[PDB]
Design a protein around this ligand. Structure first.
Ligand SMILES: O=C(Nc1nc2ccccc2o1)N1CCN(C(=O)c2ccco2)CC1
Length: 119
């Protein structure tokens, strides 16, 4: 029922994501010189370095907020892809599956801890 445990669990999961080859394109903000129309399609750039820095600054209150930003990385990739068969989109789908498999317990444990706190 540790209400704070999610933060180190998220740090460890980001470490695993950074070791995944599939995270390569998502590890820093999209380069606008490589993709000059990127901000005509995508509203809010997110990448994993921005998520890690936000966590490490103490600017997430809950793992739900971190999860929303990670999911934005993946929805941005789906919105920008010209094809569902894209290399970088295909990498996003595998990385998303990996992320969702690991974040599930982090969310469940946090929400259970909060419920216990408010019992
Ligand atoms: O420019 C990058 N990644 C990147 N990672 C860097 C590290 C260092 C310097 C520049 C970097 O640029 N990507 C393009 C857009 N993409 C898509 O979601 C997508 C779907 C279909 C085609 O692209 C996301 C990542």
């Amino acid at each position: 029922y540790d209400i704070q445990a999610w933060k180190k669990q998220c740090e460890e999961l980001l470490n695993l994501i950074f070791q995944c080859e599939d995270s390569e394109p998502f590890r820093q903000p999209v380069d606008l010189l490589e993709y000059p129309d990127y901000r005509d399609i995508i509203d809010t750039p997110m990448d994993f370095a921005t998520v890690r820095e936000t966590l490490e600054a103490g600017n997430y209150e809950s793992p739900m907020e971190l999860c929303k930003d990670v999911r934005l990385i993946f929805s941005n990739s789906k919105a920008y892809t010209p094809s569902k068969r894209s290399r970088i989109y295909s990498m996003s789908l595998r990385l998303s599956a990996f992320f969702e498999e690991h974040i599930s317990s982090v969310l469940s444990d946090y929400k259970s801890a909060l419920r216990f706190h408010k019992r």
